[PDB]
Amino acid sequence: KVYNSIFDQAYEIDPIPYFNFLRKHDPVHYEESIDAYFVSKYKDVKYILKNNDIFNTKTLAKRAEPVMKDRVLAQMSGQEHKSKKKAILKGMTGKYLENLMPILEKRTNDIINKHIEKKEIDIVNDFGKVFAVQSSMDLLGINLENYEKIREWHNGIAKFITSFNLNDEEIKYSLECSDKLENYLMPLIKDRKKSTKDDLISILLEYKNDENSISDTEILALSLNVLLAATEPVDKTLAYLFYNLLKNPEQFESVKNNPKLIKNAIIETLRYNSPVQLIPRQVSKPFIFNNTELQAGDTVICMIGSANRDPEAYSNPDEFNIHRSSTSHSQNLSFGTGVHTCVGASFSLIQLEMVAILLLKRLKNIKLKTMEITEHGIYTRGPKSMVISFD
């Protein structure tokens, strides 16, 4: 009936032609392999995410609980969601943020110092994947000793969350990974209870729901939620940022000349190469977009990358342009919108600006070595490698 499928081999290699086709010819597109509709236009994605009652987050509960071990922020609503969301934000704002950022500068310079004498560095594999997990561990309060194993287990859990047809042996490994992370993490939650530090895990322990407190298994689930949420997109976005700047030498120079433009470059990178590509919701009642009827219990999947390149929301949407100013410009959907918008958005922009500015300060006469990237992932998406040389 319809011959263009999200799961075509061509899609993961280059989804942009698919974005353009779907928005123009099938904006609410059914995929029988996973019994879900993919939503490609900016207007409809925005509407879905802004109407949490019609499109709720219970979808993200069977695709999460197996590894998260208890309730995650997305599953919550009402006063509980708002107050716990505020608790998490407390660990990346105020005094917690003032303390964290010097530490993330250290993380960054320690990685740089590991590679500076080789005169090249892989922004994906040498920097991004290491910095991303370490920064998440520092946010939480986890000692960097076992960070290599933390990365391994994180990868296994993330794969279960971001995948669509896992086989039985792949599933069993993702679960093992989450037990090892639980086995590792629960003892530190039990130690943090007594001696209390100034980190996010202690914030969660001091939480007061009137006079109640989240169970340890729920602190673990929320701690795992932050670990997964903060790690995955940081690597990808840093790589995309430097790739796009170097592929547009004139814009790279504008940033070098006015470093303030770096914030805009990060935002444009998040729009152009959205590292979180899909956001699922469950339909709570009969509903219709364009011609396409949806029923209660159906699953819709917002295509963030498609929406962020919608010509109805941006002029020249498929061009990287750090100087976009609000013929047509909209707020991008890379952090979502509405009730469940990313709690880490402001911290992410601050952390990414710090790292980019330090890389630009210490690596002189940067030159691209990976002339053509190859990207992988349809749920979370980024380059396999992104190597740069420097003096």
Ligand X SMILES: NCc1ccc2[nH]ccc2c1
Interaction partner, residue 161 (ligand HEM, ligand X, none; CB < 5-8 Å by kind)? ligand X
Tell me if 226 contacts ligand HEM by CB under 6 A: yes
271 annotated as ligand-binding: no
25 annotated as ligand-binding: no
Q: In terms of residues, how long is the chain? A: 391
Which 8-state DSSP code applies to residue 123? I
In the complex with ligand X, which residue's Cβ is closer, 351 or 380? Answer: 380
Site residues for ligand HEM, 338-367, by CB under 6 A, read 340, 342-344, 347-348
Minimum distance between the CB of residue 276 and ligand X, rounded to whole angstroms?
4
C-alpha 191 chain-centroid distance: 30
The neighbour count for residue 211, using CB atoms within 10 Å, is 5
Interaction partner, residue 383 (ligand X, ligand HEM, none; CB < 5-8 Å by kind)? none
Pattern 171-210, ligand X, x by CB under 6 A = ----------------------------------------
Pattern 230-249, ligand X, x by CB under 6 A = --xx----------------
Best CA proximity match to 306, nearest among 218, 381, 225, 359: 381
SS3 242: helix
Strands 299-303, 120-122: pairing kind:
unpaired
115 annotated as ligand-binding: no
Which 8-state DSSP code applies to residue 319? S
Identify the residue among 227, 228, 267, 373 touching ligand X (CB under 6 A).
Answer: 228
In the complex with ligand X, which residue's Cβ is closer, 154 or 192? Answer: 154
Tell me if 158 contacts ligand X by CB under 6 A: yes
Residues pairing with 38 in the sheet: 29, 301
Q: How far apart are CA 11 and CA 107, in angstroms?
A: 36
User: In degrees to the nearest 10, what's the CA dihedral of 71, 39, 12, 310?
Assistant: -120
Q: Which residues of 254-271 are buried (b: 16+ CB within 10 A; e: fewer)?
A: bbeeeeebbbbbbbbbbb
Identify the residue among 48, 74, 204, 214 touching ligand HEM (CB under 6 A).
Answer: 74
In the complex with ligand X, which residue's Cβ is closer, 221 or 255? Answer: 221
What residues make contact with ligand X under the rule CB under 6 A? 158, 161-162, 228-229, 232-233, 276, 342, 380
- Known binding residues for heme b are 281, 340, 342
